[PDB]
């Protein structure tokens, strides 16, 4: 909580927010990211699978706020029918698609159109590794719209047995709520790391600060491994920036 107490973090966020209003170039910038300088190499190769960081105090977003794309295993009939009929998930997803249909209908410029229309992409964990070839490069550089791994039903796989195919609408909704409210991060085999902590015009500066403390606590807490506790050896420095703005330091060892 020492970072929250320091006035520097408060000062940096005030300057950053002020510029976005002043500067025409930063007008389309809406998200606030923190750049963390871990002391030593994380040693985790980028697997492009987001890891959820729980933000206890405040929620970044709600499922109803965003366009959500669900990519399901072939055939998508069982999942599309079950999710659409259920009252909890009848109106949760903008579109439900299968991998094979997704590859066929969207190619080239259509993939670019798909990128803009949807704010959040989620996919069955079974088909997550296929998406990089399908969705293309645009989805998979920058970390803004990486698909999230979700599980359709609570059934588990056992060796030498066949998993029963089911769709649990309440479980799917619960996972999506966690994804939206909580922030996320992707490990990489280098010092730098980027995490979204706030949204301009929606979170007050005290709220954005609290999200940073939750992010730092989770990433440094060894008890939260493997999802957390990835920053071993402390943090050399932390900055704050938008997509196109410059980095404002908020902590330095």
């Amino acid at each position: 909580n020492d970072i929250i107490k320091s006035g520097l973090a408060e000062k940096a966020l005030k300057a950053l927010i002020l510029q976005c209003e002043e500067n025409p170039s930063l007008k389309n910038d809406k998200d606030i990211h923190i750049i963390i300088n871990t002391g030593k190499k994380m040693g985790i190769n980028r697997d492009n699978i987001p890891r959820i960081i729980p933000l206890t105090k405040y929620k970044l977003f709600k499922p109803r706020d965003l366009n959500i794309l669900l990519i399901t295993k072939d055939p998508s009939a069982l999942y599309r029918e079950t999710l659409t009929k259920d009252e909890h998930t009848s109106e949760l997803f903008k579109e439900i698609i299968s991998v094979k249909n997704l590859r066929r209908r969207f190619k080239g410029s259509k993939l670019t159109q798909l990128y803009k229309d949807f704010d959040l992409v989620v996919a069955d964990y079974r088909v997550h590794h296929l998406l990089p070839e399908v969705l293309g490069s645009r989805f998979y550089h920058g970390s803004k719209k990486l698909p999230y791994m979700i599980r359709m039903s609570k059934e588990v796989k056992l060796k030498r047995q066949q998993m029963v195919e089911k769709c649990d609408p309440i479980y799917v909704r619960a996972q999506l709520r966690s994804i939206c409210k909580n922030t996320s991060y992707i490990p990489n085999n280098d010092n730098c790391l980027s995490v979204r902590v706030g949204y301009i015009q929606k979170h007050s500066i005290p709220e954005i600060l609290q999200n940073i403390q939750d992010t730092i606590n989770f990433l440094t807490d060894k008890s939260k491994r493997p999802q957390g506790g990835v920053i071993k050896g402390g943090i050399i420095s932390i900055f704050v920036k938008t997509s196109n703005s410059t980095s404002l330091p908020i902590y330095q060892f």
Partner: peptide, 24 residues
Amino acid sequence: VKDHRYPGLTPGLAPVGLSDEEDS
């Protein structure tokens, strides 16, 4: 929860809590 076919599942699975399940 672990799936031998997909090791990537166990990391990066959305945590689910009681507040998430209860209807708004």
